[PDB]
Design a protein around this nucleic acid. Structure first.
Lengths: 156, 225, 129, 259, 212
RNA sequence: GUAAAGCGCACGCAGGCGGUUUGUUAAGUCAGAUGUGAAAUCCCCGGGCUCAACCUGGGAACUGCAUCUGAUACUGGCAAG
RNA sequence: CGGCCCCCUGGACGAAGACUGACGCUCAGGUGCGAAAGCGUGGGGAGCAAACAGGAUUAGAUACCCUGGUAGUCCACGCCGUAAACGAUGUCGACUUGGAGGUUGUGCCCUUGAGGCGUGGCUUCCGGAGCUAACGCGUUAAGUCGACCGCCUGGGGAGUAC
């Protein structure tokens, strides 16, 4: 039921007395096609093991997101370290207008319709984190009604 | 259940000095006496009662309780308390990642159990002396570390702690896993990670004992229920 | 020097929400009062109380729902350096309608929805979410 | 309610700062630490050497009560300054009692003049005296049976510096530190001084009215450099020391202990 | 292996080997997901038990909290909506709809026994309409019993039993202040009418004395 | 602050911004109307060339400017505090 | 900016009151002050010391080290107008958890003692939330905001040429 996308894999080095020890980092993200989403960032000497780790980590520490039907509930900004991200709810049919790692996380999240730009850095890791942050902070109408002591129709 | 007079007698109301406090504890502080913080018993009591009730409820559903104190003043007492209600405890140094990294520690438990078996049930004696001394030493080490939690099986369903600042590693583990935390929190301590905080003197022995005894009684009650 | 009182208000509120302050006090002004009233109506705060004769002090009481604050965001829009005036058609929607935009109009200060209903625009004071 | 506020001020009313109210019940003994609870934030890590009387064995079991001392709080965890100092206040009260009737009567046995004046000891403690006071007249207890028993009749006390000289015999007979710092001066006046803190080059014995002495590291013993003062004497103990040197200007009285 | 390392709280296993094997399991809230681990990648481990000892309809239910959530979980895999309770023998009265009852009940002698041991006691699968039918068959009876309790005039009794919840059968132990809100409450008399019902219970005990 | 980027420091004209209360004005601001904003182009609904491009009817738009009539919370002016 | 004294003189802070009644903040151009070195004229010249000379060192030593040593450093009056002129952090105002100090006021308190409880100004260190690329900053912000100004737009060429 869960869908999982390996966003990126990158070779990283550690210099030692002999020479360079190489290793691989795997950035993955998983989601159930609904609110729930989680990213994982694994590392191992070989690629498949590292992606396996990324999947494992993503599977835990997931996070829920309040989706109005296929899209978002309102425009939302999210940042992390360099990657600053804007994403905006959009009409059915438009699809996921987003670039790169961001796209991937959106798809697994089960959002189908967004207009979305990544300002600043586009370092996959940071940008996916920023996306997750923007999705988490985003609140729903019912939530704001509760926050504020009102009905949904009062807020419209 | 536990009265205010008794707590006063114990020395709960006493709290750390005025240069060592935490401003998140400002609500729980009443005043400062001889440049020493006083804990507000009026606000402490009801919450302590609450915490007791929650612990009882946990017990009723057959919850596993872990008693943590590594202050080495009240290690004996926390062990005693754990045993009275036949629950589990960590009276010596908490192993970093005992709960988060359970699966590894579970092997540790198993090795300890095997060693215990060898010692007692085998009755095999006839072991090379140095080797026998080494095995004995290993047994002692593992008993000290994991004696209380050996029969635990899996992960506790609640975590009682005697000092938050001292056992912050355990607290953090519980939070990461989501285990309910029941902490005694002096003025210097940080109660943010704690779910059911308890403002009381972690240091004084009699106060610690009192805390323990009430907790044990309510666990026993929940078991009876 | 102090140049924008309203903005100072909003910053005070923001800082109180951040710091989990129960109530936030500051010198009173009519526009400030009206803004506070609007917020209360829109439920971002519990209650506001002006007190004093010579130099009265507005005291708002801040709102906290499940630990975290109610006023998720609060920005000035109009400011002394650069004023913003909006016509009724052009009026904004804060957080896609979930938040509000305080707007001063000829018929008083009101939320953006209220202004739209009335059929008139004006100076956009602040967004609240 | 105000129950608690009234209690807080009640409990203020029923404790004081110094070691005055004998309140701490000995709730755990083990060698070499005694511990009490005088209604303080924590329990005191008491030495055994505050509580053995005059021949080297303990005297108080569980439940027993002595007050300790205060006005210093939490070096990082714990509570007190020790209780024998409390006993010093009782000794001071006994000495003051003399004033009432102009005669304090105890046993006082003064064999030899440490710093000019015979040393007189009251039950547990031993204090040092100025010369004249040991004897009412030139009688000179050197010809008396050693460590003889008479009493103490006060000849001289310094009234800020605990130097008290008393008259053993003859029952029938009946700023501030630094201007005139020439009393213990001449070359070699020995003193009885409690050490305060050993700074790994020193010991800081300093007793005589707000002064500072250093018996630092060189004498201390009859080994020079491998000594490490903490091993060789004590913490908080009244000892043999004498001046050897005074600055009245740069306030460095450089005592010694090899004597 | 999670279950083996105390990560999947498995209490009872009310299952019928050789047919259906539905069992619920709890877990310490720590992003574990008990059923998920028991299932695996597209029922990876689920298929193992499926063709383990023989073609069995193994099922896993995400245990929520206490026995109330165990009831619905014992009705799975299906669609429970509500259920009744009692004392020692609560008898979980399954409340579903005819359309969903076909799958819920599954087989007359299969899911009625497999889900009966699920809670350890026994369940009584019923229908949404059935519940209401029996529900009313209870309102009339604290009244449907020849009215052997308080009793006074009948014209006042009808207007009192109109607003009266659960008739008057032992209702004095409930709130004795909301019937005073009723249009007509001078001196404590209705608070006394309930006392009459208590006396009626004593009278019923006297009737037991007449029969014992 | 360290990546480019705080005048070496001040005073200070012009300029920019301006505590709080009342009154007034109505310049800014907002609302409505009138006049205009060529046609074509763009966009919406239609029609005609077999379709399309293309042609084409009606609308919308042309975010503006000018006026007149209102509104007066805010900003401004004036008067008193 | 550092020995004492005197004469003339600017600012800061506190204590209470009394008064004025928005008179305020910022500031392109403009004006002033602006280390050291340097320049001009006139004085002065102990020590130190660019330049210079000799002796060493060295492969060489137009340096480092040694012996000497003149401009200058000092004073008066002018000019110069720059420095890693740095907190590499523009000015003014408001708001946001704490601890340990220093310094300088001041209110009360039995100063019963060097103290006890406050309340102001300036100031050093640590550290929370928050912020930050991180380092770190952290009520003296690099946090949360407002007003005004200054400045940046790849490295070199170049802060150079005209």
């Amino acid at each position: 039921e869960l869908q999982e996308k390996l966003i990126a894999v990158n070779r990283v080095s550690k210099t030692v007395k002999g020479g360079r020890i190489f290793s691989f980092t795997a950035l993955t993200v998983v989601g159930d096609g609904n609110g729930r989403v989680g990213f994982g960032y694994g590392k191992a000497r070989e690629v498949p093991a590292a992606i396996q780790k990324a999947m494992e980590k993503a599977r835990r520490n997931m996070i829920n997101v309040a989706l109005n039907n296929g899209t978002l509930q309102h425009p939302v900004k999210g940042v992390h370290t360099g990657s600053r991200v804007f994403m905006q709810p959009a009409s059915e049919g438009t699809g996921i207008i987003a670039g790169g790692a961001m796209r991937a996380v959106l798809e697994v999240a089960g959002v189908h319709n967004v207009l979305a730009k990544a300002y600043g850095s586009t370092n996959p890791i940071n940008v996916v984190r920023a996306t997750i942050d923007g999705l988490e902070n985003m609140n729903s109408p019912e939530m704001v009604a509760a926050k504020r002591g009102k009905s949904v129709e009062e807020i419209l | 259940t536990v009265s205010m007079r008794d707590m006063l007698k114990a020395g709960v109301h006493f709290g750390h000095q005025t240069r060592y406090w935490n401003p998140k504890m400002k609500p729980f502080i009443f005043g400062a006496r001889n440049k020493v913080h006083i804990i507000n018993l009026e606000k402490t009591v009801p919450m302590f009662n609450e915490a007791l009730a929650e612990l009882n409820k946990i017990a009723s559903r057959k919850g596993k309780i872990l008693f943590v104190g590594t202050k080495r003043a009240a290690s004996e007492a926390v062990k005693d308390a754990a045993l009275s209600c036949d629950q589990f405890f960590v009276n010596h140094r908490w192993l970093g990642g005992m709960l988060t990294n359970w699966k590894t520690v579970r092997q540790s438990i198993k090795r300890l159990k095997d060693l215990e078996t060898q010692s007692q049930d085998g009755t095999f004696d006839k072991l090379t002396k140095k080797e026998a001394l080494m095995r004995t030493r290993e047994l002692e080490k593992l008993e000290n570390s994991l004696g209380g939690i050996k029969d635990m099986g899996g992960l506790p369903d609640a975590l009682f702690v005697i000092d938050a600042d001292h056992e912050h590693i355990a607290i953090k583990e519980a939070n990461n896993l989501g285990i309910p935390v029941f902490a005694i929190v002096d003025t210097n301590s940080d109660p943010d990670g704690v779910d059911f905080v308890i403002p009381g003197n972690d240091d004084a022995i009699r106060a610690v004992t009192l805390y323990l005894g009430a907790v044990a009684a309510t666990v026993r009650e929940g078991r009876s229920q | 020097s102090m140049q924008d009182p309203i903005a100072d208000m909003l910053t005070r509120i923001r800082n109180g929400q951040a710091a989990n302050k129960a109530a936030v006090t500051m010198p009173s002004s009519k526009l400030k009062v009206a803004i506070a009233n609007v917020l209360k109506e829109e439920g971002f705060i519990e209650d506001f109380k002006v007190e004093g004769d010579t130099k009265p002090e507005l005291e708002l009481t801040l709102k906290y729902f499940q630990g975290k604050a109610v006023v998720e965001s609060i920005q000035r829009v109009s400011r002394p350096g650069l004023r913003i005036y909006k016509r009724k058609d052009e009026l904004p929607k804060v957080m896609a309608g979930l938040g509000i935009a305080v707007v001063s109009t000829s018929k008083g200060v009101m939320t953006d929805r209220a202004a739209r209903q009335a059929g008139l625009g004006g100076e956009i004071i602040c967004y609240v979410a | 309610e105000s129950f608690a506020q009234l209690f807080e001020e009640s409990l203020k009313e029923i404790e004081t700062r110094p070691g005055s109210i004998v309140r701490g019940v000995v709730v755990a003994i083990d060698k070499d630490v005694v511990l009490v609870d005088a209604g303080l934030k924590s329990e005191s890590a008491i030495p055994a050497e505050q509580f053995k009387n005059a021949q080297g064995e303990l005297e108080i079991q569980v439940g027993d009560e002595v007050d300790v001392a205060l006005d210093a709080v939490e070096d990082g965890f714990g509570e007190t300054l020790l209780s024998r100092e409390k006993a010093k206040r009782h000794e001071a009260w006994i000495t003051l009692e003399k004033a009432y009737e102009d005669a304090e009567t105890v046993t006082g046995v003064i064999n030899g003049k440490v710093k000019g004046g015979f040393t007189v000891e009251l039950n547990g403690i031993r204090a040092f005296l100025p010369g004249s006071l040991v004897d009412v007249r030139p009688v000179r207890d050197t010809l008396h049976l050693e460590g003889k028993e008479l009493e103490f009749k006060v000849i001289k006390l310094d009234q800020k510096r605990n130097n008290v000289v008393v008259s053993r015999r003859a029952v029938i007979e009946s700023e501030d530190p630094w201007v005139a710092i020439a009393k213990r001066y001449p070359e070699g006046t020995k003193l009885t001084g409690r050490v305060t803190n050993l700074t790994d080059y020193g010991c800081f014995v300093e007793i005589e009215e707000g002064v500072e002495g250093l018996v630092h590291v060189s004498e201390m013993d009859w080994t020079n450099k491998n000594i490490h003062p903490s091993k060789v004497v004590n913490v908080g103990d009244v000892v043999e020391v004498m001046v050897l040197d005074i600055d009245e200007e740069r306030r460095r009285i450089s005592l010694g202990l090899k004597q | 292996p999670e279950i083996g390392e105390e990560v999947i709280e498995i209490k009872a296993a009310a299952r019928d080997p050789g047919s259906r094997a539905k069992i619920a399991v709890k877990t310490n809230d720590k992003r574990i997901d008990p059923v998920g681990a028991c299932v695996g990648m597209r029922g990876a481990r689920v298929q193992a038990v499926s063709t383990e000892l023989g073609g069995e309809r193994i099922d896993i239910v995400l245990w929520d909290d206490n026995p109330a959530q165990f009831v619905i979980n014992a009705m799975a895999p299906a669609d429970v909506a509500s259920i009744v309770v009692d004392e020692d023998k609560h008898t979980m009265d399954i409340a579903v709809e005819a359309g969903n009852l076909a799958q819920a009940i599954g087989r007359n002698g299969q899911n009625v026994r497999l889900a009966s041991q699920l809670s350890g006691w026994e369940l009584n699968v019923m229908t949404v309409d059935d519940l209401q039918a029996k529900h009313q068959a209870e309102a009339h009876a604290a009244i449907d019993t020849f009215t052997k309790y308080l009793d006074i005039d009948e014209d006042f009794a009808t207007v009192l039993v109109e607003e009266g919840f659960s008739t008057l059968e032992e209702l004095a132990y409930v709130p004795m202040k909301e019937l005073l809100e009723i249009e007509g409450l001078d001196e404590p008399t209705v608070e006394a009418l309930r006392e009459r019902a208590k006396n009626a219970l004593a009278t019923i005990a006297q009737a037991q004395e007449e029969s014992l």
